[PDB]
């Protein structure tokens, strides 16, 4: 087998345009569930007034991704934001997207909604054929493969709310068996039709207060939220930046249950955890943090926590930290796993665990919380070091679990060439992007790896990115220069002086 590493990362989550804003909201305790009526009138059909909603769903750089104005107008917002997030994620790891073109990279996308196709195709008299191409759920990954020229599998999975982690597990399986040299895993969920919220309310899952209060005595339901997240996986030989290493990922279904289809069975989850960490050869003590599903339900939370306690906390003498990203941004059904993965990776990178909100008293049914075996992160904590676990469970009955080993690479010791001035080159759609890259590179003049990774992603033909600019670092006469690169190839002539 070959190592699998999470290289890139990017997404657009509630009240967070990018991952940096998402982390700033997470650490600062900002509540990303809002009471404004953007998608639909607040309080409609008795629905909760709160939901995690993205900032904007109507922005798309169509010219770059080769979508004509008519096609873009008839494309699902999920797909547009997912294309943008995928390009962001591939370049985050320092991998130039054109370097993967024609390879066997695969696209696994976890989605559970196709509301745009239903909205566009309502009028038979005046509908457009290309609406299906941009809205068909199978196209949520086929379009990514088409643009990025990936020859690997291109699938879309539902998995009933555990879809993002299911796609992550499938990509891990593909890369592990050497079938795919890389993989793009993404999950997208956007709330457009109030009828789905009404259905979820009828089933008895949503919370009247619109808050996903997990690990708490007053757990009623979760708050539906939007979100688009894409993650890049690669074999270790290809990854430039390594956020972590996937030690083992698995799956299993609860099967028959006397309670019904929508009642979790903690024994199956415990079996999944134990089997995964026994096959991966990782002792339970090594675990430091567990990313519980944390949907804030009255029955699911006790079952999940008791299963976790039996699986991991059976013998360990140190308390196991627990937390849920859904106390901050709500619960995106298809993309729940990717949000948790983003939170965990960002917390590892910044060295602190993002605190969990809406935790005042522990639910009496969970004995671990009342005791000290399990400790909920109610305020920022430093990272001691250890394996991290993320598990996502769907109301259909599916389960997923991933064991992550954090990447701990100490900064390199000073070298003689460190003080030498370096060159930084940037490319962007508009001068704003080039200026942003140059300024950020200036603020980190001493980070050789960051500068090299930025340079690797600056070699794009002027047709795609018609602006450019350099900035020499470490020089007294240092100032960025930018200008618009003309189209058309130019011969490179040499002259030797006398």
């Amino acid at each position: 087998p070959e190592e699998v590493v999470i290289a890139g990362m990017s997404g657009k989550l509630p009240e967070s345009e990018n991952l940096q804003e998402f982390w700033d909201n997470l650490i600062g305790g900002v509540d990303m569930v809002t009471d404004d009526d953007r998608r639909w009138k607040a309080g409609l059909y008795g629905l909760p007034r709160r939901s995690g909603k993205l900032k904007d769903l109507s922005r798309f750089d169509a010219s770059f991704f080769g979508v004509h104005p008519k096609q873009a107008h008839t494309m699902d917002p999920q797909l547009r934001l997912l294309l943008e997030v995928t390009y962001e994620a591939i370049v985050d790891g320092g991998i130039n997207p054109d370097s993967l073109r024609g390879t066997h990279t695969g696209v696994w996308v976890g989605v559970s909604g196709s509301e745009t196709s239903e909205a566009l195709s309502r009028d038979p008299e005046t509908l457009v054929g290309y609406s299906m191409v941009g809205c068909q759920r199978a196209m949520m990954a086929n379009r990514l493969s088409f643009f990025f020229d990936f020859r690997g599998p291109s699938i879309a999975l539902d998995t009933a709310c555990s879809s993002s982690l299911m796609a992550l597990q499938n990509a891990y399986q593909a890369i592990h068996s050497g079938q795919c040299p890389a993989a793009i895993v993404g999950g997208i969920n956007v709330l457009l039709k109030p009828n789905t919220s009404v259905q979820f309310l009828r089933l008895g899952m949503l919370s009247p207060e619109g808050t996903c209060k997990a690990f708490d005595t007053a757990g009623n339901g979760y708050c539906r939220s939007e979100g688009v997240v894409a993650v890049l996986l690669t074999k270790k030989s290809l990854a430039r930046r390594v956020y972590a290493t996937i030690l083992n990922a698995g799956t299993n279904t609860d099967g028959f249950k006397e309670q019904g289809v929508t009642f979790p069975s903690g024994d199956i989850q415990e079996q999944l955890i134990r089997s995964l960490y026994q096959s991966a050869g990782v002792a339970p003590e090594s675990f430091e943090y567990i990313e519980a599903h944390g949907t804030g339900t009255k029955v699911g939370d006790p079952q999940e926590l008791n299963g976790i306690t039996r699986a991991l906390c059976a013998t360990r003498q140190e308390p196991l930290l627990i937390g849920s990203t859904k106390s901050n941004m709500g619960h995106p059904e298809p993309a729940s796993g990717l949000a948790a993965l983003a939170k965990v990776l960002l917390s590892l990178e910044h060295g602190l665990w993002a605190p969990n909100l809406h935790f005042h008293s522990p639910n009496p049914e969970i004995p671990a919380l009342l005791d000290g075996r399990l400790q909920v992160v109610d305020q920022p904590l430093p990272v001691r070091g250890g394996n991290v676990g993320i598990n996502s469970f769907g109301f259909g009955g599916s389960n997923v679990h991933i064991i992550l080993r954090p990447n701990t690479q100490p900064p390199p010791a000073p070298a003689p060439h460190a003080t030498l001035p370096r060159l930084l080159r940037a490319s962007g759609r508009t001068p704003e992007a080039v200026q942003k890259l140059l300024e950020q590179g200036l603020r980190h003049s001493q980070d050789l790896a960051f500068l090299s990774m930025l340079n690797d992603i600056a070699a794009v033909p002027a047709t795609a990115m018609p602006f450019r600019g350099y900035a020499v670092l470490g020089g007294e006469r240092g100032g960025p220069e930018v200008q618009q690169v003309p189209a058309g190839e130019r011969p490179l002539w040499f002259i030797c002086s006398g």
Binding site: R39, S58, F60, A72, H73, T74, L192, P194, T430
Partner: protein, 42 residues
């Protein structure tokens, strides 16, 4: 480059005269209508 604005479905794009079928077959509930025969026609 996010200068433009693209269509995103609104809340009104989704659902929020009466046709009655008179089936006189045996299984159908309107079978009694076959007893209203005038001039030898139903």
């Amino acid at each position: 480059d996010h200068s433009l604005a693209w269509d995103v479905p609104a809340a009104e794009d989704f659902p929020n005269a009466a046709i009655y079928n008179i089936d006189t077959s045996s299984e159908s509930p309107d079978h009694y209508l076959v007893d209203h025969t005038l001039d030898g026609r139903v």
